[PDB]
Amino acid sequence: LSQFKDETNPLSSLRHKRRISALGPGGLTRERAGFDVRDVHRTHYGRICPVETPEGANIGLITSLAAYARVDELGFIRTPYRRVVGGVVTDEVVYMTATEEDRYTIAQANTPLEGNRIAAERVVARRKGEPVIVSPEEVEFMDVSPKQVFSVNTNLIPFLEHDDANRALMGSNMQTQAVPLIRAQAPVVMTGLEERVVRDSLAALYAEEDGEVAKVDGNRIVVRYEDGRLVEYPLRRFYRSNQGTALDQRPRVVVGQRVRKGDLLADGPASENGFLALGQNVLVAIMPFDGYNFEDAIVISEELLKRDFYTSIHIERYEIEARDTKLGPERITRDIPHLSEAALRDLDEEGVVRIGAEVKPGDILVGRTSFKGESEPTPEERLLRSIFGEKARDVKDTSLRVPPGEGGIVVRTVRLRRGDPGVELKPGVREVVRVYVAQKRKLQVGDKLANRHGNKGVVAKILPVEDMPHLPDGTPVDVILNPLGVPSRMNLGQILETHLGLAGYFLGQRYISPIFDGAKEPEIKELLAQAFEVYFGKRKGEGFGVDKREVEVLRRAEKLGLVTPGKTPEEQLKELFLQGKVVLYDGRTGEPIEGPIVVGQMFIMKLYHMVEDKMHARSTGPYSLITQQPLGGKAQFGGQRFGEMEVWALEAYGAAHTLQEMLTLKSDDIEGRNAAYEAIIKGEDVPEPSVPESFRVLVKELQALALDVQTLDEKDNPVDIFEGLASKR
Amino acid sequence: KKEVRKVRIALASPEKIRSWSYGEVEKPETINYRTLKPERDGLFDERIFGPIKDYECACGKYKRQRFEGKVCERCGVEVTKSIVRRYRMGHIELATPAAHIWFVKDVPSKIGTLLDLSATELEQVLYFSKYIVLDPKGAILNGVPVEKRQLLTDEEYRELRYARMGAEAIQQLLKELDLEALEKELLEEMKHPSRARRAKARKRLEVVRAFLDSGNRPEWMILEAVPVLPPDLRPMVQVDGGRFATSDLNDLYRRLINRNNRLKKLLAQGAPEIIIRNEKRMLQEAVDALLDNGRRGAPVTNPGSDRPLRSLTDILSGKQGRFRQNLLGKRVDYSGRSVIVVGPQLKLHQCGLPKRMALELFKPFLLKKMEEKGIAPNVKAARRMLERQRDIKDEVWDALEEVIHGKVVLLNRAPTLHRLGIQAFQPVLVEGQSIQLHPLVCEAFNADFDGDQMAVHVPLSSFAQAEARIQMLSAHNLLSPASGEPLAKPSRDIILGLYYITQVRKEKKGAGLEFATPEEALAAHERGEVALNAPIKVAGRETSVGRLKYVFANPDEALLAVAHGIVDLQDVVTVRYMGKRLETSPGRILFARIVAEAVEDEKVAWELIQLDVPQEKNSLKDLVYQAFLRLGMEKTARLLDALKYYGFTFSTTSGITIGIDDAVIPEEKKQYLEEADRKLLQIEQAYEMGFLTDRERYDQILQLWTETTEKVTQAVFKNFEENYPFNPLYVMAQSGARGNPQQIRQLCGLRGLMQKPSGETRSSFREGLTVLEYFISSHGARKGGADTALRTADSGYLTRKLVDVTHEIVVREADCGTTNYISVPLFQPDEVTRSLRLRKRADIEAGLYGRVLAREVEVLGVRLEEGRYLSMDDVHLLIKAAEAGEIQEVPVRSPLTCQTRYGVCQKCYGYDLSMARPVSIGEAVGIVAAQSIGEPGTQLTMRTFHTGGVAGAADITQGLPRVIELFEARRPKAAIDPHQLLEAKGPEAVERYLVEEIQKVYRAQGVKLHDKHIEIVVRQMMKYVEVTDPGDSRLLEGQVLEKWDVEALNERLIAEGKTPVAWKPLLMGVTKSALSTKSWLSAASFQNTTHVLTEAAIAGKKDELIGLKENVILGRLIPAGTGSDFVRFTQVVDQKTLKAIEEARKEAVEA
Amino acid sequence: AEPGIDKLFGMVDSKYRLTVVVAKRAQQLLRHGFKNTVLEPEERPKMQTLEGLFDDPNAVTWAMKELLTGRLVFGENLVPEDRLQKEMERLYPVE
DNA sequence: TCACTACCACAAGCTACGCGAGCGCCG
RNA sequence: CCAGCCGGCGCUCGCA
DNA sequence: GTAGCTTGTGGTAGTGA
Lengths: 729, 1151, 95
Ligand SMILES: [Zn+2]
Ligand SMILES: [Zn+2]
Prior knowledge:
It is classed as transferase/dna/rna. The structure is cut from a larger assembly and holds chains A (about 725 residues), B (about 1150 residues) and C (about 100 residues). Chain A has about 725 residues and is of the alpha+beta class.
């Protein structure tokens, strides 16, 4: 039941903190029984978010709870409902138990009201998980707010009302995987909780009571409250999240500043201005390019990387120990026994790497030296030493190196010596060493991003702003989405965001659309009309009117039926601008793209690059003791699984030797893999496969069981698998 | 160095135990803490299992490879690696016998069945309890003469003295049994008495023969010596700080030593019966522990984790058992994986790969290449140079860039459903992380770009490198092994761009449209266009003004105006081609020219290029198909790469983007939602006075919203058809590109009305979908993700069975000469009353495409020779002819009737190899059919019933369930019972029902696969039959049919004495067909892995290795593919070596 | 794609057989030295850092081009099993 | 007659449950 | 040439 | 949990030494 804190981002940490599970002591629920349980039951109202659960084998069982849902005395998640006597509503509320809930007639909050008086006779209400249209007279209790039925996690999506529940989970789940960006900006559109989140979570730091500002260090901020008190508030400089993420608090206030009780002091890891901010709002073009935004493929502007827009600071806590072998305690020293001084530069401090140094895959992070043999010296390695320089330090190199993939800059180091001040030093362990290194994993092409709605995609190309699409006004887009991945998936909620974000750019402002009660289509056209004044009004006064390009498309647009023919292009454009689409020039050819293309400020996010992101490529390496199948982990990547699903595929094809190759020389065949390596090194042709181990070990298992498994030849007679290790004496 | 052609499971003789065994484990002394060395002769002593060190020994007399096969005169140690240890077994001399629980507790207790005692409870009763027996003779009484084989207790046995018991009791029994004697005894009991007692004797008789026949006699069933698994096998490691992990077998292997040793001391100390047994219970129980845990209670490791220590069974059977481990194979050395990202420029022939990865991959190939150049002196040197990323010189990148040459690799997607789930490409090194995949394959491996992760390997052997770039190279795998249909079909992206350009536009027709005749209609109606009255695309039949104003000579001519902004590609113009005055749009012709560009044969291009209509997914499907056919593989390839780029670039500029206003709402809904809401009250006010009831009020409301939803579905698409032919959301759905059909509106109904949690069933997504309206639909999207979840499990599982059975099925042949053909029906009887109808286009295509005629046929006027392979063009011919009324069925060769015992001929199968020409001999069809079947099975789309009244729309969909009940003989929930069907109409009939009764599904899901595959399978279900008139072996028996074609063929033909082998055809489910197969190598793989061998040991089964499953596990080259004896031997020669051997000939003339 | 893949196709009665051929051929080309060819003069395989494919880039790619010509011959049992490995090391030098 | 059971039915017993991937920790 | 990473728990993805 | 494959044995009408 208890797990690592998904501290991707304080929010991620906060949800990982609110989710409910099924599996457990075992007396409660087992794993293979759940069709009726995993169902989103009718009482799950305002108590359980029916969106929060994880997609996969373990679904419905694991699920975080609703907004206000709270446990009373004995685990009964009550949910609030305002009281109402007659046709009169109350500012009073009651947390009702699921049981007591069915007892009454509850109504939605969408319900019109004069402050305390209902407004419609035939108004909606829900009896016991049953939709019933009742009169204002039989009304006994109402929902507090639409937010109460979803999780905090889920309550964060703008136009959730226009998106499908299924892709909503993807939106909700993907939020727990966000990553703290150096530059964090709260969503161009919010629902109104991002403040609350950071507040209720301990992201940002708040002011206790009214007061004034004293010291504003990059490490500490001291204040003098109005009650004559003053405190020094230390700031978490740079700490390693359990997920290996950055944890800092960025002051945003100046010295000597009269502050209000509970005003943002320093921005938490991911708060723009005490507002939850993860990812940034980007200008985006909802159009298809060559193929770079294929099915869920995406296209980025080199312009975004220039202004370190999407950069993630990631911290991996590699770790190594100085074991005490009876062959001789593994020593820690800058002595790397065999080859260069070139690789001993950065390892300044005796054994220690200097902080603030650039580390690439393959470099030694920490030097370690144990002893060569198991217990005896070596006869072939003995004569070789004497030749060049018999006097060579017998200690072996078992030094922590930069695992292939990527390394960054060592920022912090920790070393625990003999005289334990007060630490639980495991037995045999002489001493330990932790190294924290981070890298501006610059949003590269391999990375993936997604909006709060569910659209998921991997960056296909990093176009130079030079030729990527640009507005009639020099300003170029940041990203280009593939429309295709939109009609199929059901979430017009994002289309409304790009549009609304559109206004905000030339209107320079943010907004807050509650869940079901947020903004509306007409209202949006309003602002657009107004934003069109910013875009073109400015363009008109700036000395010029329209381009021959803006008209070619206008011709095509009128023919389209997007614009009512017969209007002055000035008017036509406005009408087309209100449609959420504007004209865009190719930038590569500068020829406009026949047909207006909607665009907008879409708030999108970067997604977790597990060490599963940083690729795994293996040639040769470790194998399993029992099964002689290859594996990795620390340094050696670790092989990939072939699975039968795949076997069969090859089985479909006539890949006989290709299949032979896999089962053997490539995985289990010992003398095959061995001699194989020797073969390719020679540029020769692989010998013929010997018996795989998983097989040999298998027979013996069988033989261990009374079962006797014997190999046979053409004419039913013995053959020998065990090359000669089965015969006695 | 030969090849193992047969595997054999047989019981083990005590001596054979001694045989595999090296020394005897006699004490539970693993390893003593102070010394990480094996304690004593314990379970880890190296004598008993193997050299604790490489080639090295104990004290150190001999230490290298020079003397690998000699032992040290002082302490005995021959050495290879430590493998020897993980190889060698051990044996424990048990005090008093005990027996394998596998045979004792197997449903048909293989021991209680054989020995007639209460097949079940009595076993339990004395085996783990107290009851003694008498050996040969015992002259004195108890009340009745010596019980030659009956049992007595120690009490009326103790009295006597002044015999053996437990498992020591049945030990004697088995020995004194003269199989023969009792064989004669049951043969009689079987046929004479009635079914009651005759029935038992019968099943009871299989076990016996089993022993005798095979020889391997049954006396070994009891245990007195236990084989010890090598050491290395069950781990004994150093976790951390001092922690140690050891395979649980050791916790039980110790539980066992203690008691046996405890017993040797107990029996040698004093013998108080009570406690003697108390421990024999614990003994025999610990026995079962390591063999099988759970079959009887479950032993736990002391307080820390109440987890049943994994037993031998659990190790062999299961989803991740041992067979599970092997049958599927698990970890390559040269592998890798990373995220995917599109490669537009990428040609099918190649694929983009991050250098950095490559680096590690072709490490060896590179290394060698290093020394080859001046970059590195020696190997070790080259490695050190690469040990770090900042040590790399730019020159290295050249060498690597060099070793890869044309060398190619394979790409695997997440779920590997079919052969295309993996393909070979020409890696073109690249910077960064992600991996560039070509897009049209996205459909092959069901994969979109939303985070998709896949794998990759390298054809090391030049032999293995060969096949890859050859038969695995994607470019050569265009068609679908499922449907002769291509699988490189343009996708949602390209196609979108391709449709844009070729669509024709129609605008306004307010004034005259009949230029068809008037010349004043040419002048006047031409000035009206110049004006504002007549548009450029008016609905005039002879030619709208668009054609009149502009006329183009040469092709180029026309395109020059477009760019000049005089004409748009979607305009109806008039242009002349190589020989015709044609009236068509700029886009339609452009498409034509491009066609001619990719491939030079300009004339053969337009032959299949109907540029009448806007290019849709099927028209392109039909063209790609064509191309591949007419022109040839590689040439049809240079094509795909072309369309790709253009449908890509065409998409960019098309300027299509979804807008909120784009999702346009019909003005219509308000009226119809009103005309329907008014009828709801006519039916609700129906409720007040009892014209109806409860059941009927519910059904009529269902039909109201079932007919009204289909009504709003036509309207949105009709409006887009007449008013907005070019809507991003519309044009998207119509093109193969992207969209949904039942789904959009169906989706709307779903959000508006979704069924309740159980199943008992106003807003759009454009307009606010109300609060509750969103929670109601949640129940379904909730059930949908769960249903599909179990569906993937059953699909791979189903398919797992497909392979379990059709693996062995391959094309090793010479036209199976048995010409017993199947007749393919063209007309279907009952869809209403009694009527005759022409089956569907598709279905029929699916039944006859690329097949083999059993006999000649003269239809409409052409002569269809016997044996010819009919192409789709021919398959169409018949249609037109049946339409005529000259033909009703079709004599066709098929596997169901192919002769070839194990395998099928090239004639019984057909056309479609990945290519279109006849299938090449040595093709693993058993698999290809299995995949092409199991890949579609997962998605498991919607199933339900939808019924209307007056408009009258009834929809019919069903789930995998049936598919299951089908492949597995079963008794459907409500359906035609096969067992009865066969009885009624016989084989050729059931055969036919199955197949057709299985096709209905996919037909109902949009999926399109050929019947071949299914046949394959079903024939496999009917490869066994029962008996009725004996010859060699007794009647009632289920066995291999063809194998009977063998014995019968010889009982009449060769050896005289016509002993009619009256048999009875037997039906078996896919499951049960695999379960019981000749080879057990395949059977041991699935099910318990218990019974499988249990049965195959008794009978020293000589598993003739034919088939892949069995031969794969061995890691032996596949009996097929390249291992097909047909081709596995083939020599190549240069004309220079020919005359050479010819001279080895000319020199033979002596003196 | 690959040159005249269709040409080659029709040349065989069975696909999987084709594979066997080339393979055992490029195996020969390597083993007994790489000068064991039959079409090097004028037109021949080629690479581009320089034009050195002429020596030993991809064997199978060569066997392709050769096989695309009517030079070689393939039969179930054309020349006595072991008598072939003896006469192939006698006339081709490369090492 | 005497008598042994013979043969239908229903409860009761084991085996599946896609493919791959990573991350912290547990003895 | 020797080691931590056996297994597993729990968690995320791709394919709707 | 869920369906389902198979065995095994006890419960309710026959029938011949
Ligand atoms: Zn010695
Ligand atoms: Zn046949």
